[PDB]
């Protein structure tokens, strides 16, 4: 078993995690390049595999606590960059990829928190430190 407190996204400025990090989710994708020739041993769909583009997307939720890493993401959004982002998996290790800052949003209610979602997507080739 692995603690959900262990997997951490973190910005550059040298890497530090953001403050409100209530729920985060790295999500990989591939578009499944269908190569269905007429011949196929039972009429099954055949796929190519390595031809497909592959992606990554980070969706971080949290409560707005002011930190320099939280101010950094605003500066990354206004001065639109694609810097290095890094996401630990507990016992796998970090990812250390270039991402962008696709859509952030700050929210607040009459009774609750200052909360924020932070949605990111892949911008380059990723890595894995094991």
């Amino acid at each position: 078993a692995q603690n959900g407190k262990d997997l951490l996204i973190k910005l550059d400025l040298q890497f530090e995690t953001i403050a409100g990090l209530r729920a985060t989710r790295i999500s990989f994708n591939a578009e499944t390049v269908d190569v269905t020739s007429l011949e196929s041993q039972g009429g099954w769909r055949e796929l190519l595999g390595g031809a497909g583009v592959r992606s990554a997307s980070i969706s971080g939720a949290g409560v707005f606590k002011d930190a320099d890493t939280d101010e950094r993401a605003r500066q990354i959004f206004f001065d639109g960059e694609v810097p290095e982002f890094q996401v630990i998996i507990p016992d796998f290790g970090i990812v250390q990829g270039p991402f962008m800052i696709t859509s952030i949003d700050y929210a607040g209610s009459h009774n609750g928190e200052a909360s924020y979602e932070l949605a990111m997507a892949s911008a380059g080739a990723l890595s894995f430190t094991a």
């Binding site: 390049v33 190569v35 190519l48 595999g49 390595g50 031809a51 497909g52 583009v53």
Partner: peptide, 14 residues
């Protein structure tokens, strides 16, 4: 029935 053919690249291996 072609003077030329036209092969396309649609992805790294396609």
């Amino acid at each position: 029935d072609t003077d030329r053919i036209a092969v396309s690249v649609q992805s790294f291996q396609a």
